């Protein structure tokens, strides 16, 4: 579950990153 | 528009897609993650069409 | 192992790799995102 929570938080972070880089 | 992007990401559930990609990367820890990601997305495409 | 995972992500610059694929994804907003991403990593994996 630790790996799933880490992937979920990283996914959210990468998306924020990307979205505030295409704008 | 950040807004066009945000809506596209939501409708295609791209956050879940990246999350699944990360889990697979962490399971496999491939020598060549670009080759592994290419093969993973190809696999998902095939399954989806099945 | 969680620490094995973070270290992998760090060493292979996975966060940067995936963020750039999403930047390209929001530029194209393709009808088939998995086909688009497959071709993107194929391109990257040739450059």
Swiss-Prot record, chain A:
Coiled-coil positions: none
Subcellular localization, as worded in the UniProt entry: Cell membrane
Tissues expressing the protein: Expressed in heart (at protein level).
Entry superkingdom: Eukaryota
Region (PKA-RI-binding): 1-19
Function: Binds to type I regulatory subunits of protein kinase A (PKA-RI) and may anchor/target them to the plasma membrane.
Subunit organization: Interacts with PRKAR1A and PRKAR1B.
Stated family: Belongs to the small membrane AKAP family.
Protein name: Small membrane A-kinase anchor protein
Gene this protein is translated from: C2orf88
Full-length numbering of the shown residues: 56 to 78 of 95
Curated annotation (Swiss-Prot), chain B:
Expression (tissue specificity): Four types of regulatory chains are found: I-alpha, I-beta, II-alpha, and II-beta. Their expression varies among tissues and is in some cases constitutive and in others inducible.
Compartments (UniProt record): Cell membrane
Post-translational changes noted in the entry: The pseudophosphorylation site binds to the substrate-binding region of the catalytic chain, resulting in the inhibition of its activity. The physiological significance of the in vitro phosphorylation of a proximal serine is unclear.
Function: Regulatory subunit of the cAMP-dependent protein kinases involved in cAMP signaling in cells.
Quaternary context: The inactive holoenzyme is composed of two regulatory chains and two catalytic chains. Activation by cAMP releases the two active catalytic monomers and the regulatory dimer. Interacts with PRKACA and PRKACB. PRKAR1A also interacts with RFC2; the complex may be involved in cell survival. Interacts with AKAP4. Interacts with RARA; the interaction occurs in the presence of cAMP or FSH and regulates RARA transcriptional activity. Interacts with the phosphorylated form of PJA2. Interacts with CBFA2T3. Interacts with PRKX; regulates this cAMP-dependent protein kinase.
Family note: Belongs to the cAMP-dependent kinase regulatory chain family.
Protein name: cAMP-dependent protein kinase type I-alpha regulatory subunit
Shown part of the complete sequence: 13 to 62 of 380
UniProtKB/Swiss-Prot annotation, chain C:
Compartmental location: Cell membrane
Domain of life the protein comes from: Eukaryota
Expression by tissue: Four types of regulatory chains are found: I-alpha, I-beta, II-alpha, and II-beta. Their expression varies among tissues and is in some cases constitutive and in others inducible.
Coiled-coil segments on the chain, per record: none
Changes after translation: The pseudophosphorylation site binds to the substrate-binding region of the catalytic chain, resulting in the inhibition of its activity. The physiological significance of the in vitro phosphorylation of a proximal serine is unclear.
Record text on subunit structure and interactions: The inactive holoenzyme is composed of two regulatory chains and two catalytic chains. Activation by cAMP releases the two active catalytic monomers and the regulatory dimer. Interacts with PRKACA and PRKACB. PRKAR1A also interacts with RFC2; the complex may be involved in cell survival. Interacts with AKAP4. Interacts with RARA; the interaction occurs in the presence of cAMP or FSH and regulates RARA transcriptional activity. Interacts with the phosphorylated form of PJA2. Interacts with CBFA2T3. Interacts with PRKX; regulates this cAMP-dependent protein kinase.
UniProt family annotation: Belongs to the cAMP-dependent kinase regulatory chain family.
Job description of the protein: Regulatory subunit of the cAMP-dependent protein kinases involved in cAMP signaling in cells.
Protein name, UniProt field: cAMP-dependent protein kinase type I-alpha regulatory subunit
Protein's organism: Bos taurus
Lineage: Eukaryota, Metazoa, Chordata, Craniata, Vertebrata
Residues of the full protein shown: 13 to 59 of 380
């Amino acid at each position: 579950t630790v790996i799933l929570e880490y992937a979920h938080r990283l996914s959210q972070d990468i998306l924020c990153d990307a979205l505030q880089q295409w704008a | 528009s950040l807004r066009e992007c945000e809506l596209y990401v939501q409708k295609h559930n791209i956050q879940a897609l990246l999350k699944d990609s990360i889990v697979q990367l962490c399971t496999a820890r491939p020598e060549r993650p670009m080759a592994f990601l290419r093969e993973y997305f190809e696999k998902l495409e095939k399954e989806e069409a099945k």
